[PDB]
Design a protein around this motif. Structure first.
Motif, PDB file in Angstrom:
ATOM      1  N   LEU A 420       0.849  -1.182   0.000  1.00  0.00           N
ATOM      2  CA  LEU A 420       0.000   0.000   0.000  1.00  0.00           C
ATOM      3  C   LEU A 420       0.889   1.237   0.000  1.00  0.00           C
ATOM      4  CD1 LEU A 420      -2.032  -2.156   0.550  1.00  0.00           C
ATOM      5  CD2 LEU A 420      -2.967  -0.802   2.429  1.00  0.00           C
ATOM      6  N   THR A 421       0.774   2.052  -1.045  1.00  0.00           N
ATOM      7  CA  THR A 421       1.612   3.233  -1.183  1.00  0.00           C
ATOM      8  C   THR A 421       0.857   4.298  -1.965  1.00  0.00           C
ATOM      9  OG1 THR A 421       3.732   4.078  -2.021  1.00  0.00           O
ATOM     10  CG2 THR A 421       2.666   2.316  -3.265  1.00  0.00           C
ATOM     11  N   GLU A 422       0.994   5.550  -1.533  1.00  0.00           N
ATOM     12  CA  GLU A 422       0.416   6.659  -2.281  1.00  0.00           C
ATOM     13  C   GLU A 422       1.422   7.266  -3.253  1.00  0.00           C
ATOM     14  OE1 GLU A 422      -2.625   7.067  -2.426  1.00  0.00           O
ATOM     15  OE2 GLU A 422      -3.041   5.672  -0.781  1.00  0.00           O
ATOM     16  N   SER A 423       2.633   7.557  -2.777  1.00  0.00           N
ATOM     17  CA  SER A 423       3.671   8.055  -3.673  1.00  0.00           C
ATOM     18  C   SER A 423       4.246   6.939  -4.533  1.00  0.00           C
ATOM     19  CB  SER A 423       4.785   8.725  -2.873  1.00  0.00           C
ATOM     20  OG  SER A 423       5.494   7.769  -2.105  1.00  0.00           O
ATOM     21  N   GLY A 424       4.213   5.702  -4.037  1.00  0.00           N
ATOM     22  CA  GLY A 424       4.837   4.574  -4.692  1.00  0.00           C
ATOM     23  C   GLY A 424       6.203   4.204  -4.149  1.00  0.00           C
ATOM     24  N   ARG A 425       6.780   5.026  -3.268  1.00  0.00           N
ATOM     25  CA  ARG A 425       8.163   4.816  -2.846  1.00  0.00           C
ATOM     26  C   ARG A 425       8.363   3.442  -2.220  1.00  0.00           C
ATOM     27  NH1 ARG A 425       7.076   9.107  -0.023  1.00  0.00           N
ATOM     28  NH2 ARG A 425       7.144  11.185  -0.983  1.00  0.00           N
ATOM     29  N   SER A 426       7.443   3.012  -1.355  1.00  0.00           N
ATOM     30  CA  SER A 426       7.608   1.707  -0.724  1.00  0.00           C
ATOM     31  C   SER A 426       7.601   0.588  -1.758  1.00  0.00           C
ATOM     32  CB  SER A 426       6.525   1.488   0.328  1.00  0.00           C
ATOM     33  OG  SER A 426       6.729   2.348   1.435  1.00  0.00           O
ATOM     34  N   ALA A 427       6.702   0.664  -2.741  1.00  0.00           N
ATOM     35  CA  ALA A 427       6.676  -0.352  -3.790  1.00  0.00           C
ATOM     36  C   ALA A 427       7.954  -0.322  -4.621  1.00  0.00           C
ATOM     37  CB  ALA A 427       5.449  -0.160  -4.683  1.00  0.00           C
TER      38      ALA A 427
HETATM   39 NA    NA Z   1       5.159   4.682   0.332  1.00  0.00          NA
END
Ligand code: NA
Ligand SMILES: [Mg+2]
Ligand SMILES: [Mg+2]
Ligand SMILES: [Mg+2]
Ligand code: NA
Ligand code: NA
Lengths: 520, 520, 520
Positions: A420-427
């Motif tokens: 689950l990511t909004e910016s995408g950084r974790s993915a």
């Molecule tokens: Na993130």
């Protein structure tokens, strides 16, 4: 019982033994991790065709601004989005599709032959040919004198340097140097046309980062809300910063992919990579500037350093060239695609194969099939160890979560990683350490989803439900969404196991929570 | 700035470079991962002295039932529990202490020399000596006829076999077998006393797995609520099963540590290991049975395979022998302890050094200092990789959670891992993969806490708070307990990062949730 | 059928698996590669005993000049040579024995207590003690005032520094410093006698590299034709250069082994190694100067870096300490010896065990037995790769031949490497890459043969035949001499295979010719 996914090879102790265990009867998985970038054009800009492009596996639609007007590309972008949204009714089977603008970029062009755009003269091997900047000749080119529009040319080449003309078709050597002219000898001859491209191998070309046309196109791309920009002829970090400037505050979230195209780009790659969001190995133009037999060195070097940094890298140009006129590729072309995936490329690209050729759908379907086989044939255990080795100077907390989660997905052979990511950084950090399982990334940010196609293995899923007030319920809502998408797509089924990454609290700046969860 | 924890050596590429980087000026951390097992005896069984043992670092009290009545050991056990609970007033600084029963085991004994318990005769190299089973001579032993009490001895030795008498001091070679006698030739002569111990090197000794006395002592061990049993002279899996059986339902939760003491036990180790909860390398007796110069081979083979299986392994015997009479050890002893920890031993043991020596507290404090140093000096990265490889056939979920957690702890240099566990299983699996940071295991099961000392790196913390209705509040309660313990014990301070393993729900079978969390 | 020489473990992929495959029933080979250095003294200096010493495994006779007159040591040296040459009758079984001179070195000493040699005072912990350089109190030491003979002490110590007295028995802490005195606080108390040694942990002590006595003794050593000097208390390269300078031109071929004994020696080890011919880890003194729990760190660091460099390294002190009074060692001592050989020590040493103990010959025999076992349990394949990796900065031709020869010996399981050398250099380069088979070095240089025992695995054989006119015949003669020694001692038999290193021409300068040769 033959394992699937080349898992027997996966257990080898050595690279050699890994290769020896590659099994044509070991079935790959359904999920395909390598993004496919398709150049759109006459053969594929119809809404009817684009729909099949998506169903065939297209992930990113590339608009080449080397030709075509703002009105022409605007219509293609509209059709792409029309085709894309035609699947929106069912958000479980909806594939986000990204829009990329490939700039024309700075160029060196010759003049007109006998005032004509179609006239030609034959240059003979060993002959003499003076290059001039005297505009009295810009429409009066012939076998003995050739005008071109790069006025600083004498300042960046030396006696003995080489000048290529027309996509490398003709090569000249600089014998003498003058105030506003060069006297050259014709190495390779042939037929010289009008307004042809000129390449200066080895030179530090001081053309600006963007042409005046690029600036208009970049502003057009902001208006049209493109997701990424493929910036041409990037030679130094400064060129990237200049593209960033032009895109400015309103385009600050459009990703900048630098196209490496000549010697200086390769030589200064480290600083270019640092400034860029991603990299394209522009093998077509690179093979004109540098010797063709060296292109694979640049490709492997660039992909390796991109993987090390966790920045997206694209392999492009002639991957399935023969499929412009044929419905099946050559063996060298299937090899090239597979070795591009084995190298570590986040995306593979099609240009003429989908822009103008007779079998655009077959090119997309082939790349899709090869990538899945190449993805399973990676040596994940070694790859993980060497990436962890390369980044061990960093103690970043998200990297730790990514590495532990990818490590866990290896151990239990998880069917996917839900992030689950909004910016995408974790993915992105999870994709950087190269799990074999697909990463289902749930975002409420539509652009995050489209840009996700630049990272290997990220399957973006858009959540359109309002944010639940109770965080725990909002997390479970999105997790079950990924569970449903995965089941529908055939990535996993009830009883399988997945790695779930989430934020502990609404305020968590990354997915600091990891879980191994059975699929319901 | 000189890095701590041998972390410069940690970044080495090869084992040789790691060794070359060992730095006497690189200070270890406060936490000591290796368990210290102390044999209690006349020098250390008082409450006053037992309190200083706990403070010095004792984690397990060992009762050696080779000698002493049930009354004697009952009082020793009482004083240990009295000394241990003297610190229970502070649930934050309380250290659980385990109680271990070391059985005497089956024996082979000789008879009386010339009817006296104090007489002796001299056996000369090359002389003839007859071993008889005829009880007419069981009090008529001399330099010609030697009676012993093992009546199947002729069924397990051959012509050419060696017989050892008096802890190896005397050795005989079988020259003739009879129905109830053996004709032997003296190899190593010496002075033979009465009722000496006999060893049969290389033989499959069919003595029972437990003696009559052992059965009584095991019954007593259940009644006394002992945490574990060190089972002597284990030669095969069936022997371990008989001990298990003897312990029955009432003792089903007492851990069985098989002592490897002779050739057969080493040759049949795999099956023994599978049947046991843990292993002790009983080097003392093993070196009587096999050539002393080979003991290190068995010690390293056994520790390695125990590390492979994740089962506790104890290194015992003469580790700090010279400190029975001196306040400092020899260099061989300091090195033996450090190499035992580098080998991978979960616990190291003290026998006479604490049971009867003059400096039992200094002995405990020396093992404590050495272990911390040796722990830093391990090559964690290679150890982790090789343990992962060795168990990659397993896809167990808790193993995946443990490997991802240790992996994460390495990446971000976590100051600790916090594991919430009732049975201890989740924590045991974290320890199995050998992080460098300590494992703070919070349990409401006192026995689980005492038995945790069997596993490298597990600092057990007994939660005496009542369960909270809200699972999240109960989890957060026990996590904050581990936080306070770690801060009070100096393992970490506010701002450091730790790994936290918890069950997502009250019914999760293991710690399926992992978080990276800053210390408040 | 069980493999020999731990060859099953040798085929492992990881150190863990290699460790798990160590097999007490895998028999070692007859040849022992680790040199045994014996300190000769009253217990062992008779010709008859020295004869037994040689037969039991002694390779180097060490004379400790800490005590004893030139006349006493000259007589011991004479007896060593008498015993050594008593075997010269048979030049196939003859074994060279080296002679080593270990210097007393510089010391710091206290004065007399209350004008007596046999008189003591008790220093209670926390008391105050004043150190003074005022010779008024040099015979009037008591529990308040303490004299010592190091005039510069105040210049090398600070407030907070520590002073150790009587081999670490008493520890003082400098609280106040004057110009010729120090006010200290007693940390560890005890009974203080007269004329005790002082140690300044962590100090950059500025005593001379050699003392006046050392200069006379080193000169004595040159006259006595010793093979090597063990130089005490080496703190820096310059100290080595001083010893070299003292030995002068006539002693230029005597090898200098630097004894590392304190903090500055460990921290400056690299410059000491570069300047030395070899290194001794003087663990006794080192553990007086540095915390005893750190000694194994210094041992493994030093051994690794000496192996890396290819320079001899000796592990010394208390390896079998208990055998001074007992005929069998402890399990910690057996382990200490094995681990020293696994660390990579070229030689292991006995001090009081052979110089004054009740069981000199049992000590020699025990080290011999242990070394052979540990030598087989090395991980030769990994060790070779890592040594090759560490030395890849060198393109030396002889190094290339040595590596190629060791590689070949691994591949065909050669029973030995035969090396013809006059200086030994070629044999030394082979030794540093650690073959498992013995190195038979045939030399016409008697001193080369004696000094060869410093290098793991070199069995020296002195050729006494005159030089043949035909170079090929002189080579064949020496090679065949090696064949007969190997057969006589049971290293190989007819039909086995050996690697043979020779010079192509008489002036080649090194063994540039490698052959695989069957044993005739
Ligand atoms: Na993130
Ligand atoms: Mg271009
Ligand atoms: Mg026993
Ligand atoms: Mg000294
Ligand atoms: Na658990
Ligand atoms: Na030589």
């Amino acid at each position: 019982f033959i394992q699937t996914q080349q898992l027997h090879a996966a257990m080898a102790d050595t690279f050699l033994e890994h290769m020896c265990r590659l099994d044509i009867d070991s079935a790959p998985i359904t999920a395909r991790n390598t993004g496919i970038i398709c150049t759109i054009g006459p053969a594929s800009r119809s809404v009817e065709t684009l729909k099949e492009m998506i169903k065939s596996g297209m992930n990113v639609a590339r608009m080449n601004f080397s030709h075509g007007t703002h009105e022409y590309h605007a219509e293609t972008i509209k059709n792409v989005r029309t085709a894309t949204e035609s699947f929106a009714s069912d958000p479980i089977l909806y594939r986000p599709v990204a829009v990329a603008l490939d700039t024309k970029g700075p160029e060196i062009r010759t003049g007109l032959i006998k005032g004509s755009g179609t006239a030609e003269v034959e240059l003979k091997k060993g002959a003499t040919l003076k290059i001039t900047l005297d505009n009295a000749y810009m429409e009066k080119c012939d076998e003995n004198i050739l005008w071109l529009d790069y006025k600083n040319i004498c300042k960046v080449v030396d006696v003995g340097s080489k000048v290529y003309v027309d996509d490398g078709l003709i090569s000249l050597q600089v014998k003498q140097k003058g105030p506003d002219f060069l006297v050259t000898e014709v190495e390779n001859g042939g037929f010289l046309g009008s307004k042809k491209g000129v390449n200066l191998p080895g030179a530090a070309v001081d053309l600006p980062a963007v042409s005046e046309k690029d600036i208009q196109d970049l502003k057009f791309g902001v208006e049209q809300d493109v997701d990424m920009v493929f910036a041409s002829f990037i030679r130094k970090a400064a060129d990237v910063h200049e593209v960033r400037k032009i895109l400015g505050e309103k385009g600050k979230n459009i990703k900048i992919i630098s196209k490496i195209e000549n010697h200086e780009g390769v030589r200064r790659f480290d600083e270019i990579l640092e400034a860029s969001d991603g990299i394209m190995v522009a093998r077509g133009d690179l093979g004109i500037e540098i010797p063709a037999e060296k292109v694979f060195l640049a490709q492997k070097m660039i992909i390796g350093r991109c993987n090390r940094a966790g920045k997206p890298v694209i392999c492009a140009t002639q991957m399935l060239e023969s499929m412009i006129k044929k419905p099946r590729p050559t063996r060298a072309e299937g090899s090239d695609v597979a070795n591009a995936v084995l190298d570590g490329a986040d995306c593979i690209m099609l240009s003429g194969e989908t822009a103008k050729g007779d079998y655009p759908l077959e090119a997309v379907r082939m790349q899709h099939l090869i990538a899945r086989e190449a993805e399973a044939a990676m040596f994940h255990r070694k790859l993980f160890e060497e990436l962890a080795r390369a980044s061990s100077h960093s103690t970043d907390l998200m990297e730790a979560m990514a590495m532990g989660s990818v490590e866990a997905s290896y151990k239990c052979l998880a069917a996917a990683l839900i992030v689950l990511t909004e910016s995408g950084r974790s993915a992105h950090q999870v994709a950087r350490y190269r799990p074999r399982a697909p990463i289902i990334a749930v975002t409420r940010n539509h652009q995050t989803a489209r840009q996700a196609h630049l990272y290997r293995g990220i399957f973006p899923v858009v959540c359109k439900d309002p944010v639940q007030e109770a965080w725990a319920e909002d997390v479970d809502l999105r997790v079950n969404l990924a569970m449903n998408v995965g089941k529908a797509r055939g990535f996993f089924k009830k009883g399988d196991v997945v790695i779930v990454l989430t934020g502990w609290r609404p305020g968590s700046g990354f997915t600091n929570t990891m879980r191994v969860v059975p699929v319901p």
